[PDB]
Design a protein around this ligand. Structure first.
Ligand SMILES: C=C(C)[C@H]1CN[C@H](C(=O)O)[C@H]1CC(=O)O
Ligand SMILES: C=C(C)[C@H]1CN[C@H](C(=O)O)[C@H]1CC(=O)O
Ligand SMILES: [Cl-]
Ligand SMILES: [Cl-]
Ligand SMILES: [Cl-]
Ligand SMILES: [Cl-]
Ligand SMILES: [Zn+2]
Ligand SMILES: [Zn+2]
Ligand SMILES: [Zn+2]
Ligand SMILES: [Zn+2]
Ligand SMILES: [Zn+2]
Ligand SMILES: [Zn+2]
Ligand SMILES: [Zn+2]
Ligand SMILES: [Zn+2]
Ligand SMILES: [Zn+2]
Ligand SMILES: [Zn+2]
Lengths: 252, 253
């Protein structure tokens, strides 16, 4: 029957479609994840209703070990699928069932062009340029629990200045534009921003290796079917075209 | 009880360990996948027995849909785990339960250095340079089902001369060394070969994006446990160090 699909707004994955008419239901949304959900609903033959997550969060754990965001929706069996740039992490995989990744990525640095910073070590060995990440995101949680010396130096920097942690990508991008601040952001979002903001660039390569997956409740019968469908999309280059359609900007 | 682990020999993943004593059991084997297998047993707390797959094949389907190799071992519940460079494909994922990939890779070209070839289009636009892939492998299945014009053209060439398809990576490497032949090989194996034979090189980038996974029987309780352990190993850069250990060589200039 109809699956409840939890998600949230994040360019270019899930966005509100601009129109002169008032949009209702699933017609309100467009983006990479919306196209991916349409492909899956057709290959697997199911209908769905898209519902934005109320708190607008992806999924993090509090002091009592309770989750929030889309991860909490899947745990409480209030949603059947989560289509969003939801990073596959070991701690999240213990709570929900991730499909195999439909997109691979890694953490990198976003900062303005013309800067003596070339790697992550350059940001760690100085203080004039502030840096941070989205609070309670997969990138921040990666640095908080990391044991590599270079990243803990960064975590000490982020944990000392609470301002360094931004609320969302929008605040992080604007602070990179207005102040001497470099945002630790996932590589796929960097590609999107740089082709559209011709003053921002990527600094260094990818420091780690992660992927975006589609969340399901633990034990869901759709997880493996979606995984097989995602793999079929990969082998026929459908995800390559799907990304190129949503990542190309007005050039620089 | 001890989990049966099926595998096969493939450098540098699974190799015979050299020793002055005659080795028995799991002590006979070493390599990337053996190190990965030891870490998983340490994190998940299980014992295991390594058994080389008898037919020496990874896993392919015939016309009737019947499997062979390690994939057949997991289907028939004759092995509990499959630790090897087993490429995650949709057709294989329909038969067994893959863990999430511990290594990402793609299809590229292995060929001699002195050639004005730069991309897959250069191989398609000629016929004197023979090319192919391992028969019944994941790379061959990629070209057979491709709809991109360049990749369809190469598959027609491979289907024309059945000799072009080699039996294994060794025969394909040896043919690349002895003849005017370019082997379509997975990128991880190319990195290993190029650092040791300074006449072979990688041509162009990655044609697709796939990963090596650990196979389990359909419905196995260890699949998600192994996935979580692999994700934990990934977040600590342990798989990166593990690769650099077995992927080093001399380093051709
Ligand atoms: C945009 C946000 C807050 C999300 C997107 N993927 C990560 C996640 O799924 O947690 C977050 C970014 C990051 O942590 O670098
Ligand atoms: C070494 C061999 C024959 C294996 C390794 N992974 C692929 C597989 O799992 O099918 C094969 C290589 C290839 O297809 O080019
Ligand atoms: Cl929007
Ligand atoms: Cl999985
Ligand atoms: Cl502060
Ligand atoms: Cl050997
Ligand atoms: Zn339809
Ligand atoms: Zn339920
Ligand atoms: Zn393509
Ligand atoms: Zn393209
Ligand atoms: Zn260990
Ligand atoms: Zn330990
Ligand atoms: Zn059985
Ligand atoms: Zn069994
Ligand atoms: Zn690394
Ligand atoms: Zn390194």
């Amino acid at each position: 029957r109809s699956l409840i699909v939890t998600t949230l707004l994040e360019e270019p994955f899930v966005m509100f479609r601009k129109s002169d008419r008032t949009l209702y239901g699933n017609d309100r949304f467009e983006g990479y994840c919306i196209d991916l959900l349409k492909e899956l609903a057709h290959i697997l033959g199911f209908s769905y209703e898209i519902r934005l997550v109320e708190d607008g969060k992806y999924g993090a754990q509090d002091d009592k070990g309770q989750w929030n965001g889309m991860v909490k929706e899947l745990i409480d069996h209030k949603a059947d699928l989560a289509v969003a740039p939801l990073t596959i992490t070991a701690v999240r995989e213990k709570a929900i069932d991730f499909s195999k990744p439909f997109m691979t990525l890694g953490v990198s640095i976003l900062y303005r062009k013309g800067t003596p910073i070339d790697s992550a070590d350059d940001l760690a060995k100085q203080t004039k340029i502030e840096y941070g990440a989205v609070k309670d995101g997969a990138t921040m949680t990666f640095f908080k629990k990391s044991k590599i010396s270079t990243f803990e130096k960064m975590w000490a920097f982020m944990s000392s200045k609470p301002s360094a942690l931004v609320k969302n990508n929008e605040e992080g991008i604007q602070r990179t534009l207005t102040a001497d601040y470099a945002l630790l952001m996932e590589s796929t979002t960097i590609e999107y921003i740089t082709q559209r903001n011709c003053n921002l660039t990527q600094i260094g390569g990818l420091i780690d290796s992660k992927g975006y997956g589609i969340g399901t409740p633990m034990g869901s019968p759709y997880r493996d079917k979606i995984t097989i469908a995602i793999l079929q999309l990969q082998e026929e280059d459908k995800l390559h075209i799907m990304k190129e359609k949503w990542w190309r900007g007005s050039g620089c």
